[PDB]
Write a protein that binds this DNA or RNA. Sequence first.
RNA 1: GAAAUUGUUGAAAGGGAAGGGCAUUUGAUCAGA
RNA 2: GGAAUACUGCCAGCUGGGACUGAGGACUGCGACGUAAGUCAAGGAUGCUGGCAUAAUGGUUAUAUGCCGCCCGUCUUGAAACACGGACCAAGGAGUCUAACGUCUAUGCGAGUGUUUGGGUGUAAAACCCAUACGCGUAAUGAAAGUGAACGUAGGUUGGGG
RNA 3: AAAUAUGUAAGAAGUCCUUGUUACUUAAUUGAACGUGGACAUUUGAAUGAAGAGCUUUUAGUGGGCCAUUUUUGGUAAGCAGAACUGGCGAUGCGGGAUGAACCGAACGUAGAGUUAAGGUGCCGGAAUACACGCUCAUCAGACACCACAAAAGGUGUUAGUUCAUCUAGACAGCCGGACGGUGGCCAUGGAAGUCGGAAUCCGCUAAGGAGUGUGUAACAACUCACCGGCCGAAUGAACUAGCCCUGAAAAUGGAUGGCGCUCAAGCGUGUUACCUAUACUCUACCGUCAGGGUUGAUAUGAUGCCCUGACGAGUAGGCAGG
RNA 4: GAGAACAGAAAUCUCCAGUAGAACAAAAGGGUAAAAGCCCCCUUGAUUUUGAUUUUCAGUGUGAAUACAAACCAUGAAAGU
RNA 5: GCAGUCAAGCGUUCAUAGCGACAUUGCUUUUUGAUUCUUCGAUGUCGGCUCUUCCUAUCAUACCGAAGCAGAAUUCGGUAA
RNA 6: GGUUGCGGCCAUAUCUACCAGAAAGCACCGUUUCCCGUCCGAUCAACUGUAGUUAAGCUGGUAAGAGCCUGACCGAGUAGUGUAGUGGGUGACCAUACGCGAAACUCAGGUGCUGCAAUCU
Lengths: 58, 159, 183, 185, 172
Amino acid sequence: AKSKNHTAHNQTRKAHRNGIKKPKTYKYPSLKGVDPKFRRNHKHALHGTAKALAAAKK
Amino acid sequence: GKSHGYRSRTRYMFQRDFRKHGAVHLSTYLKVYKVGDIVDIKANGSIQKGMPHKFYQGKTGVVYNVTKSSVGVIINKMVGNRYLEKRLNLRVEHIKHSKCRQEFLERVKANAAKRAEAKAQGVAVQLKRQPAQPRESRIVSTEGNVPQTLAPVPYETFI
Amino acid sequence: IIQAKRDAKAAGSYYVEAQHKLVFVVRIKGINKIPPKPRKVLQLLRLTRINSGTFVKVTKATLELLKLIEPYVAYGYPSYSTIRQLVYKRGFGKINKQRVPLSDNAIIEANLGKYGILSIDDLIHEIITVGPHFKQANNFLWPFKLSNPSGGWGVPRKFKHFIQGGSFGNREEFINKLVKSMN
Amino acid sequence: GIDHTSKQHKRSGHRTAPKSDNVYLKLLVKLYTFLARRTDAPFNKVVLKALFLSKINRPPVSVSRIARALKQEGAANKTVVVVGTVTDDARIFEFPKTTVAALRFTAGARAKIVKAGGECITLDQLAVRAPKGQNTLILRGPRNSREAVRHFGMGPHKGKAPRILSTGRKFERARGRRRSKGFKV
Amino acid sequence: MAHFKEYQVIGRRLPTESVPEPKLFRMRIFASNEVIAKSRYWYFLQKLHKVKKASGEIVSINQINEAHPTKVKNFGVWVRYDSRSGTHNMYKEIRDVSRVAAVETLYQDMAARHRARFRSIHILKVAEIEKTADVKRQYVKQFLTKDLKFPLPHRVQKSTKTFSYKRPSTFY
RNA sequence: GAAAUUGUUGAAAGGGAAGGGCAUUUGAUCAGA
RNA sequence: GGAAUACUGCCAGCUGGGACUGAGGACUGCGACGUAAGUCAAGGAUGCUGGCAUAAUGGUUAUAUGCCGCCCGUCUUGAAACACGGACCAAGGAGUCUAACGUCUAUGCGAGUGUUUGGGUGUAAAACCCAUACGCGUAAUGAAAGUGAACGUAGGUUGGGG
RNA sequence: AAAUAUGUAAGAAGUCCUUGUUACUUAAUUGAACGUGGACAUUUGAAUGAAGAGCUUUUAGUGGGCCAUUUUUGGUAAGCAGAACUGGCGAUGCGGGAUGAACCGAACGUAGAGUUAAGGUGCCGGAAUACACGCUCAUCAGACACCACAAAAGGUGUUAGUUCAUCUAGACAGCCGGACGGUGGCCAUGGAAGUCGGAAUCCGCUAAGGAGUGUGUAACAACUCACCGGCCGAAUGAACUAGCCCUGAAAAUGGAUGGCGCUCAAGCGUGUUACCUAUACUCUACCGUCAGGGUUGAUAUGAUGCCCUGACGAGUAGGCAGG
RNA sequence: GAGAACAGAAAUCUCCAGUAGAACAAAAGGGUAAAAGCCCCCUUGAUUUUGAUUUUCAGUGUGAAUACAAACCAUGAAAGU
RNA sequence: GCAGUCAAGCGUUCAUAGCGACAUUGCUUUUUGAUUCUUCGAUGUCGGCUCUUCCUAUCAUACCGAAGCAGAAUUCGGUAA
RNA sequence: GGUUGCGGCCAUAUCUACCAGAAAGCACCGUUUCCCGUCCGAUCAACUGUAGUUAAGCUGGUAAGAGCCUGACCGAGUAGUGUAGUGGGUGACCAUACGCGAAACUCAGGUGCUGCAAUCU
Ligand SMILES: [K+]
Ligand SMILES: [Mg+2]
Ligand SMILES: [Mg+2]
Ligand SMILES: [Mg+2]
Ligand SMILES: [Mg+2]
Ligand SMILES: [Mg+2]
Ligand SMILES: [Mg+2]
Ligand SMILES: [Mg+2]
Ligand SMILES: [Mg+2]
Ligand SMILES: [Mg+2]
Ligand SMILES: [Mg+2]
Ligand SMILES: [Mg+2]
Ligand SMILES: [Mg+2]
Ligand SMILES: [Mg+2]
Ligand SMILES: [Mg+2]
Ligand SMILES: [Mg+2]
Ligand SMILES: [Mg+2]
Ligand SMILES: [Mg+2]
Ligand SMILES: [Mg+2]
Ligand SMILES: [Mg+2]
Ligand SMILES: [Mg+2]
Ligand SMILES: [Mg+2]
Ligand SMILES: [Mg+2]
Ligand SMILES: [Mg+2]
Ligand SMILES: [Mg+2]
Ligand SMILES: [Mg+2]
Ligand SMILES: [Mg+2]
Ligand SMILES: [Mg+2]
Ligand SMILES: [Mg+2]
Ligand SMILES: [Mg+2]
Ligand SMILES: [Mg+2]
Ligand SMILES: [Mg+2]
Ligand SMILES: [Mg+2]
Ligand SMILES: [Mg+2]
Ligand SMILES: [Mg+2]
Ligand SMILES: [Mg+2]
Ligand SMILES: [Mg+2]
Ligand SMILES: [Mg+2]
Ligand SMILES: [Mg+2]
Ligand SMILES: [Mg+2]
Ligand SMILES: [Mg+2]
């Protein structure tokens, strides 16, 4: 016996019951897909900046 | 059977903007995109590489990565009942700087300048935008503008 | 204002009165079968119950909201007498998320004195003349829970526009009569 | 009828009393309820809230953790407050002299503190000494180091410790865990 | 829509820097209140000129009372109305003491004889016929004869009580 | 020594079901002060 | 030309009749009137009077009257259904225990924890006491051979209760 | 090239200034990214709201749907079959639509009072046989959306309109007179003269007459009308338009504006009031729930207690809690 | 379209116009003119390592695709690809 | 299946006595389909016999109108089950 | 202001038909040993800047020019459309209320602007 094929009925109500939540923007986002050459240089840049800041404590 | 390909239902979406076909002008390549820039996505049909999916046509996102000929764009795509972070690798032909934020940066500059000039002149800020207010009172003169009386016209066909 | 109108008429001009800066909106439709966008606008205007009313400062941003919820509300331009009676009889403040009757000027001062509002007439003034702290004063005022109109609605059917012989929409000056009968 | 903008009759979702039937814990809760009501001390309020917490929400605080908190600059003479159990830690060899207020002390932790020359005191003694939580330092143990936590959020590309009884080769390591058998996760 | 009042409504087509002081268009609207009067003004202005309420403003609205509300006049009324199948222009004649009474009679008569609702009727013009023999409708002409007299046969008096003891009479 | 079911007695009602809800009239019966 | 009146609106103008309610239970407050004493319609009813003192009010029950009221259970989009089970009543009658587990909670002890396989003992299947092991935890990773967790104040930055 | 719908932004994770790191990058401290330090807090950079916000774990049932407005596909169509957005029914009582899952109104703790919604106010039946202007007479009248049907085409029925005409220099109708000559006009036909048929669409007399409006003849002849007159004396004619009513309009047990019945309605169109009544709205009381608080300063034994304040209460499957 | 022996409608040669009305393996849609089409030259980037991303999506798999990184190469004068 | 509207034509002449093309509006549920709403813990599945009642879209009988109705016969139609 | 090299936007720049252009520049132009490439020194390459010319390219102008561009209370608040009603209508569809709002059409105007560098009567 044939039945219903598809409907989006009630789907927006279900989604809005717990709401459509914006995805929690952060500071310092992930560097996952960032250019690996840039990431390799940025690691050393952060190392040097931390070293300089620590040495500045005299 | 059904058909849902990568470029399905893109027939008019990926057209070449009638009488603007052919080579992409050089300003598109001369634009410079930095991480944190806000860009609108509009696919160029003549550039098949680095092309965005049809879903991201007209979406505005943030550049998170910069490569030789492409940028990485962050889009918040609504999936079910929440937004998922999507990272698109788009050649510069399919993106442009969003003017929804250059105007905002100009407004920020103007606000800072106005705050400086106000702290120099006196005590007033009024730095927030306000909606269109109801109109103040006005006096309308009839000098040379005697009100002309109109009436509804009778029906006629003129066919 | 009266003398300005007379002076314009004597000078052969027309005095165009300033557009109204304040409206009173009353929800005249029940809470069933409301489309999501007008329902959200009603919630944001705090009209979550039939015969609930609030003051709205008129701008483009709120005029569009009233446009969206036109078929479910009767709104108009409240007079000073209407505002005074509304605040005196059905005036409640939102204090610690509670509906506290405005039976004393100290109640108003404790919550709105930081805005220079010290009394019930201070609050009424801030509402009628849409002052700098109209938003805070109006939000302090709990939504007015009016009764059904005492002499009826004056129309056989409420849910066409006031212009079309119904009850909803802008009824600009007759909102005073409607709200007084509802008060 | 009212178009409700939020769920009606929603409980606050926070404990207002200890689930425990410990009479002494209830007495401590009464004392700190009085204190939080009539002292306006945020320390007293947070201690009253912590007195309700379940066991997994009061992870043990080790003496080494307390020693690091005292190594914090300017905190060497503060009364360390742990609403829960203080456990011993032999991985540290130099423990400082300090006063630690806690719900419970293990035998080793109490011995270590007393031998280093401090004192182990109860929360009511802490309340008597510092009714406003004067010069206190509240320490909390690691909640998300629990064994149950690592299995939370399990799914593809999550790296979240599958729930398993036997570990080793032949136990959930072949298909869906490496490219050589179908795919990796 | 109700007992009618006549309003003059003057609107502006709100001024700009290029065009200050626009042409101040006026109409005479029959409406039961000022809100309906302004709505009808904007309806007809949208029918006539390139303007809408959002791009214009009501300069003035004034109730026009009958100059001689206790003088019996004959009015020629030119209307345009929508029937079930088309639009038609009609001329009618109404005897009354005021324009508002004549317009109420016009709306009642159009509803009664053509099932034309208020929304389907445009009042093209209302004008007093100053001279007799310019009245061209017989149903008004017959009331313009000299020394007009007529009885009221079969007078039906309303009883206040359920029962009567008299077998009443319809004399008048 | 229950119920179904039944006899007698007593009470009451009964124009093509009966039973029920709200409310009170009437009859019977009863607690509290 | 001078008014009036209608209509609409306003008064912190006055006043008559009717109905429902009387919550609370020392004081505290805001006020009003008074020069002040005090008084008050001001953070919720008191005063005066009558009858009865029991079936009178009330409850229960039967009946009468006005209006309303389809047969429950079930499957179902939809049951009063011309869908199914049910003539009636009594008694019986259906998420149990176990092995191994996830979450959460309580308890004990805590880098350890688990006395009860067993031994000792006993007022004898109880209670009480206990050695060596073993299990799990304190190390992971790799197919495996194997290797095996501090540059640092056990790091830096942002937020973070106290 | 809309409308609706839709992405982003409207700041302190910001802006500006100076200069630190790097193995990246640059011709190059050039830039890139991350920073030290400094300056900017009344509107920290639109509106409105916010029984708070964020987060985590774990589990139930469900995974046959259906209906209404709108968009919409297949189909002649369907109470058909399939999509879109929303609102609903399922899961839901209540007032109204007589009756009904879905429509209108309104969502529900126990009560009192008031006011209403939708719908109604002749009687059933609570509430005006109310007011007012018109329309309709049906020998199948009509009488409230969903909804329980009716069409094309018609009607000097009746009503109201549009446009064009005739008319006291006599309109139309009515009675009577004339209605010729050229001319049997020409032609097709056996015969056709105005009149079975084609073309030509003329004039003299003319107030007026058509090479013809009909009847009649085998063809004639003859009556007849357009056309003009005699008499009467003021309004009349034609084509249209759309209201109500009527024809079109035929099914089976006897029966349905709900019934009765109703005809200047108790029908239809419209307008103004008054009135009736929902579990809705307003106020109050009481029950419970939730939330925010007060109170170990004692006799005072119920701090899980006592108390204050505010809001809320529908519910199948299902979950939990207190009994 | 205009011309040239055989040669005509169609062998080939020449000029003019020609926004693509052609072609790009295939279905359709899009795209492309000093090219993505045609011809010629050189080639193997149809390579190696393992990650990230997009569509389908449970944000699993598979397929397909995108942008890099680390190499080794091809081509070009080179930018580049 | 039945019934209309228009009227090019048929009917010697004459569209409508009787018909009526090309079109178009309907009605009916005695056809057959379409659907799958009810019934699969069961509504006895063809036809005939028997018997009652109902409908009218009337074959006959009653009374009529029209005709290309002289009579006779017949045809069309009305009220009528 | 002209012109050249490189350009940005990519017709207000394009297209058709005519006319004009001082100076410089550009260009056509002259030659074939070499590099180079062709059936063909036509293109491409090299050489001269000399033998000549503004004829063409190019630039600008003209045209009730084609196109294109801009604006409009031009059409038109029309078409369409969001929302509303126990509105109309047998229906098809339509009207009204609160909003948004085209395209064609018509009219008028316009016909490249401009960046860096160099050069010029
Ligand atoms: K069956
Ligand atoms: Mg299904
Ligand atoms: Mg496009
Ligand atoms: Mg490719
Ligand atoms: Mg009343
Ligand atoms: Mg009503
Ligand atoms: Mg409620
Ligand atoms: Mg016995
Ligand atoms: Mg018995
Ligand atoms: Mg009997
Ligand atoms: Mg008055
Ligand atoms: Mg009391
Ligand atoms: Mg009694
Ligand atoms: Mg009943
Ligand atoms: Mg079924
Ligand atoms: Mg059932
Ligand atoms: Mg049945
Ligand atoms: Mg069964
Ligand atoms: Mg049975
Ligand atoms: Mg039993
Ligand atoms: Mg199932
Ligand atoms: Mg189906
Ligand atoms: Mg179900
Ligand atoms: Mg419902
Ligand atoms: Mg009905
Ligand atoms: Mg109630
Ligand atoms: Mg009655
Ligand atoms: Mg008709
Ligand atoms: Mg009635
Ligand atoms: Mg009526
Ligand atoms: Mg509490
Ligand atoms: Mg409930
Ligand atoms: Mg090429
Ligand atoms: Mg059977
Ligand atoms: Mg049977
Ligand atoms: Mg018949
Ligand atoms: Mg040459
Ligand atoms: Mg060359
Ligand atoms: Mg030249
Ligand atoms: Mg031109
Ligand atoms: Mg509605």
